[PDB]
Write a protein that holds these residues in place. Structure first.
Motif, PDB file in Angstrom:
ATOM      1  N   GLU B   8       0.787  -1.154  -0.178  1.00 16.55           N
ATOM      2  CA  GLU B   8      -0.067  -0.056  -0.221  1.00 16.55           C
ATOM      3  C   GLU B   8       0.783   1.200  -0.130  1.00 16.55           C
ATOM      4  O   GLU B   8       0.556   2.245  -0.622  1.00 16.55           O
ATOM      5  N   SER B   9       1.930   1.271   0.926  1.00 10.39           N
ATOM      6  CA  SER B   9       3.042   2.458   0.807  1.00 10.39           C
ATOM      7  C   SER B   9       3.336   2.479  -0.606  1.00 10.39           C
ATOM      8  O   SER B   9       3.703   3.844  -0.656  1.00 10.39           O
ATOM      9  N   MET B  10       3.667   1.759  -1.377  1.00  9.46           N
ATOM     10  CA  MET B  10       4.055   1.744  -2.646  1.00  9.46           C
ATOM     11  C   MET B  10       2.972   2.136  -3.690  1.00  9.46           C
ATOM     12  O   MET B  10       2.982   3.076  -4.768  1.00  9.46           O
ATOM     13  N   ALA B  11       1.669   1.609  -3.596  1.00  7.43           N
ATOM     14  CA  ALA B  11       0.505   1.996  -4.255  1.00  7.43           C
ATOM     15  C   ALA B  11       0.199   3.392  -4.249  1.00  7.43           C
ATOM     16  O   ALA B  11      -0.821   3.946  -5.132  1.00  7.43           O
ATOM     17  N   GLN B  12       0.763   4.391  -3.133  1.00  8.04           N
ATOM     18  CA  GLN B  12       0.398   5.554  -3.014  1.00  8.04           C
ATOM     19  C   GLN B  12       1.425   6.490  -3.432  1.00  8.04           C
ATOM     20  O   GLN B  12       1.294   7.797  -3.029  1.00  8.04           O
ATOM     21  N   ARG B  13       2.483   6.253  -4.017  1.00  9.56           N
ATOM     22  CA  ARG B  13       3.380   7.061  -4.731  1.00  9.56           C
ATOM     23  C   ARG B  13       2.849   7.717  -5.809  1.00  9.56           C
ATOM     24  O   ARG B  13       1.920   7.126  -6.450  1.00  9.56           O
ATOM     25  N   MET B  14       3.318   9.077  -6.149  1.00 11.84           N
ATOM     26  CA  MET B  14       2.841   9.506  -7.065  1.00 11.84           C
ATOM     27  C   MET B  14       3.995   9.879  -8.455  1.00 11.84           C
ATOM     28  O   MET B  14       4.927   9.742  -8.160  1.00 11.84           O
ATOM     29  N   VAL B  15       3.337  10.083  -9.513  1.00 13.14           N
ATOM     30  CA  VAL B  15       4.233  10.469 -10.780  1.00 13.14           C
ATOM     31  C   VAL B  15       3.951  11.755 -11.071  1.00 13.14           C
ATOM     32  O   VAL B  15       2.868  12.088 -11.723  1.00 13.14           O
ATOM     33  N   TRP B  16       5.004  12.416 -10.955  1.00 11.87           N
ATOM     34  CA  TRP B  16       4.983  13.962 -11.420  1.00 11.87           C
ATOM     35  C   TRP B  16       5.490  14.191 -12.692  1.00 11.87           C
ATOM     36  O   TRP B  16       6.679  13.625 -13.042  1.00 11.87           O
ATOM     37  N   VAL B  17       4.900  15.103 -13.500  1.00 10.57           N
ATOM     38  CA  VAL B  17       5.422  15.670 -14.842  1.00 10.57           C
ATOM     39  C   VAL B  17       5.135  16.944 -15.066  1.00 10.57           C
ATOM     40  O   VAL B  17       4.248  17.369 -14.333  1.00 10.57           O
ATOM     41  N   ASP B  18       5.738  17.423 -15.999  1.00  6.39           N
ATOM     42  CA  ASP B  18       5.176  18.766 -16.650  1.00  6.39           C
ATOM     43  C   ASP B  18       5.993  18.866 -18.146  1.00  6.39           C
ATOM     44  O   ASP B  18       7.076  18.420 -18.492  1.00  6.39           O
ATOM     45  N   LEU B  19       4.887  19.036 -19.150  1.00  2.00           N
ATOM     46  CA  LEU B  19       5.252  19.231 -20.516  1.00  2.00           C
ATOM     47  C   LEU B  19       5.544  20.440 -21.035  1.00  2.00           C
ATOM     48  O   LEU B  19       4.659  21.516 -20.442  1.00  2.00           O
ATOM     49  N   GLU B  20       5.862  20.828 -22.369  1.00  2.00           N
ATOM     50  CA  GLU B  20       5.788  22.206 -22.997  1.00  2.00           C
ATOM     51  C   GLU B  20       5.573  21.886 -24.369  1.00  2.00           C
ATOM     52  O   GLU B  20       6.281  20.989 -25.084  1.00  2.00           O
ATOM     53  N   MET B  21       4.247  22.223 -24.835  1.00  2.00           N
ATOM     54  CA  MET B  21       3.998  21.947 -26.220  1.00  2.00           C
ATOM     55  C   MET B  21       4.239  23.081 -27.008  1.00  2.00           C
ATOM     56  O   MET B  21       4.551  24.257 -26.724  1.00  2.00           O
ATOM     57  N   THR B  22       4.020  22.945 -28.428  1.00  2.00           N
ATOM     58  CA  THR B  22       4.077  24.159 -29.413  1.00  2.00           C
ATOM     59  C   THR B  22       2.647  24.824 -29.133  1.00  2.00           C
ATOM     60  O   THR B  22       2.513  25.861 -29.985  1.00  2.00           O
ATOM     61  N   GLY B  23       1.752  24.149 -28.650  1.00  2.00           N
ATOM     62  CA  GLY B  23       0.264  24.671 -28.505  1.00  2.00           C
ATOM     63  C   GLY B  23      -0.479  23.815 -28.095  1.00  2.00           C
ATOM     64  O   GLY B  23      -0.435  22.601 -27.995  1.00  2.00           O
ATOM     65  N   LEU B  24      -1.791  24.391 -27.674  1.00  2.00           N
ATOM     66  CA  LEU B  24      -2.887  23.488 -27.011  1.00  2.00           C
ATOM     67  C   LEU B  24      -3.782  22.910 -28.014  1.00  2.00           C
ATOM     68  O   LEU B  24      -4.881  22.224 -27.727  1.00  2.00           O
ATOM     69  N   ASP B  25      -3.548  22.842 -29.417  1.00  4.25           N
ATOM     70  CA  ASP B  25      -4.423  22.220 -30.375  1.00  4.25           C
ATOM     71  C   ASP B  25      -3.962  20.718 -30.460  1.00  4.25           C
ATOM     72  O   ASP B  25      -3.215  20.382 -31.352  1.00  4.25           O
ATOM     73  N   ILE B  26      -4.476  19.993 -29.635  1.00  5.75           N
ATOM     74  CA  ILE B  26      -3.766  18.479 -29.226  1.00  5.75           C
ATOM     75  C   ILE B  26      -3.894  17.900 -30.798  1.00  5.75           C
ATOM     76  O   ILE B  26      -3.060  17.049 -31.145  1.00  5.75           O
ATOM     77  N   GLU B  70       7.460  33.668 -28.964  1.00  4.06           N
ATOM     78  CA  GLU B  70       8.324  34.612 -28.210  1.00  4.06           C
ATOM     79  C   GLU B  70       8.639  33.874 -26.877  1.00  4.06           C
ATOM     80  O   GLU B  70       9.808  34.048 -26.275  1.00  4.06           O
ATOM     81  N   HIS B  71       7.678  33.138 -26.215  1.00  4.07           N
ATOM     82  CA  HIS B  71       7.848  32.568 -25.028  1.00  4.07           C
ATOM     83  C   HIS B  71       9.133  31.491 -25.031  1.00  4.07           C
ATOM     84  O   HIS B  71      10.089  31.578 -24.087  1.00  4.07           O
ATOM     85  N   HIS B  72       8.752  30.543 -25.482  1.00  2.92           N
ATOM     86  CA  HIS B  72       9.896  29.540 -25.813  1.00  2.92           C
ATOM     87  C   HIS B  72      10.987  30.098 -26.742  1.00  2.92           C
ATOM     88  O   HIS B  72      12.055  29.288 -26.500  1.00  2.92           O
ATOM     89  N   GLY B  73      10.814  31.198 -27.554  1.00  5.31           N
ATOM     90  CA  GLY B  73      12.058  31.763 -27.820  1.00  5.31           C
ATOM     91  C   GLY B  73      12.828  32.551 -26.889  1.00  5.31           C
ATOM     92  O   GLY B  73      14.058  32.558 -27.005  1.00  5.31           O
ATOM     93  N   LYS B  74      12.532  33.089 -25.817  1.00  6.23           N
ATOM     94  CA  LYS B  74      12.923  33.759 -24.500  1.00  6.23           C
ATOM     95  C   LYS B  74      13.380  32.409 -23.917  1.00  6.23           C
ATOM     96  O   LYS B  74      14.258  33.052 -22.947  1.00  6.23           O
ATOM     97  N   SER B  75      12.846  31.424 -23.731  1.00  7.67           N
ATOM     98  CA  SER B  75      13.256  30.293 -22.887  1.00  7.67           C
ATOM     99  C   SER B  75      14.582  29.646 -23.248  1.00  7.67           C
ATOM    100  O   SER B  75      15.114  28.990 -22.630  1.00  7.67           O
ATOM    101  N   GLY B  76      14.974  29.799 -24.617  1.00  9.08           N
ATOM    102  CA  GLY B  76      16.056  29.252 -25.240  1.00  9.08           C
ATOM    103  C   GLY B  76      15.732  27.877 -25.598  1.00  9.08           C
ATOM    104  O   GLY B  76      16.428  27.163 -26.319  1.00  9.08           O
ATOM    105  N   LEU B  77      14.331  27.517 -25.328  1.00 11.89           N
ATOM    106  CA  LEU B  77      14.122  26.295 -25.561  1.00 11.89           C
ATOM    107  C   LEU B  77      13.811  25.779 -27.220  1.00 11.89           C
ATOM    108  O   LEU B  77      14.487  24.763 -27.519  1.00 11.89           O
ATOM    109  N   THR B  78      13.542  26.859 -27.854  1.00 10.19           N
ATOM    110  CA  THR B  78      13.180  26.526 -29.313  1.00 10.19           C
ATOM    111  C   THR B  78      14.317  26.291 -30.024  1.00 10.19           C
ATOM    112  O   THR B  78      14.428  25.572 -31.126  1.00 10.19           O
TER     113      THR B  78
END
Ligand SMILES: [Ca+2]
Lengths: 198, 190
Positions: B8-26, B70-78
């Motif tokens: 049970e102690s392992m069944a209650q672990r969480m999996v955290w993520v965060d992504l960055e798309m080019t847009g929300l038009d899935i 502009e944002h991802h352009g400013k993040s250096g990410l693009t």
């Protein structure tokens, strides 16, 4: 005066849109929506309005091609029978909700509420886009606090209410009763029972 | 019995993520950056996953919104997108490999800030990874909205998210935010 529209606007921006959906399955690229309910509450989960509770017509082909659980689940519910004899187009149903939520919420400020609604939004984003364009991108997930109750407050989890129903509108009312139980028992108490708290 | 408690102690672990798309038009947008991380039930980090930048076809990067430009352009990410050599298929494996040794299969939920939108792209572009995960999620943006309406005074004490330029540090803010809501909004026990 703006100060009155601010108090009025800032109060409506804190309302929630409560939905409960039933679908033919979990595959968004093939499955469709067959029953949807909607309902508005304020910041303290008090019903301000009751939206419609509709059954959307979907072709017999998909319903006959549903999974065993799905075809069995919706069979005993009688929902499968109603879908065939239904005369409610998706957009005809989509608009019926959109008008209801427009006369009760500011566009783009209210969040989606309900239990495990990350799937409902996932379908509404695809199938009812004009509807979702009225709502905030954020959701109020009654299950998110169910999980945080399960791990952090396992004692009081045992006292959570039990399931009970006939329409998605009722599954909404239970989901508020579910969330209302969490506020009474796991959040910081604001009211002693006979003073209030610091 | 004792193993079922640790199970049970392992069944209650969480999996955290965060992504960055080019847009929300899935239907027309793809994933571009991803990190992952594991916590126990009480938000203590157990293992930090990788932080990868997914190469995506070039025409879409100049077809994303001016916000995303502009944002991802400013993040250096693009810039790192073109100079990235990791595709979606290898990236999914690396994340699928990581989590499989830390969490039980299908008993752990996704967690983060508005992960319902991170899951939408993971349900589509990373299903082998999503199969290892529970269908339920834990969105800190849900108790944030709950904190506004019900505990607005303590909500003003909310810390500023540090505007992290790497999605793995973004998560650190989300947990620190969620830990806040636990301290000042959730009932204390003794
Ligand atoms: Ca994010």
């Amino acid at each position: 005066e703006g100060g009155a529209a601010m108090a009025a606007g800032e109060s409506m921006a804190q309302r929630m849109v409560w939905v409960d959906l039933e679908m033919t399955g979990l595959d968004i690229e093939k499955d469709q929506i067959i029953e949807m309910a909607c309902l508005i509450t304020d910041s303290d989960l008090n019903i301000l309005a009751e939206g419609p509770n509709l059954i959307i017509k979907q072709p017999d082909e998909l319903l006959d091609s549903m999974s065993d659980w799905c075809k069995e689940h919706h069979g005993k519910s009688g929902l499968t029978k109603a879908v065939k004899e239904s005369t409610i187009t998706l957009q005809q149903a989509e608009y019926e909700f959109l008008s209801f939520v427009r006369q009760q919420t500011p566009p783009g400020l209210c969040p989606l509420a309900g239990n495990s609604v990350h799937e409902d939004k996932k379908f509404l984003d695809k199938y009812m886009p004009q509807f979702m364009k009225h709502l905030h991108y954020r959701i109020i997930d009654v299950s998110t606090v169910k999980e945080l109750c399960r791990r952090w407050y396992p004692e009081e989890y045992e006292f959570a209410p039990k399931k009970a129903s006939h329409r998605a509108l009722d599954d909404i009312s239970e989901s508020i009763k579910e969330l209302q139980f969490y506020r009474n028992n796991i959040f910081k108490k604001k009211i002693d029972e006979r003073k209030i708290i610091e």
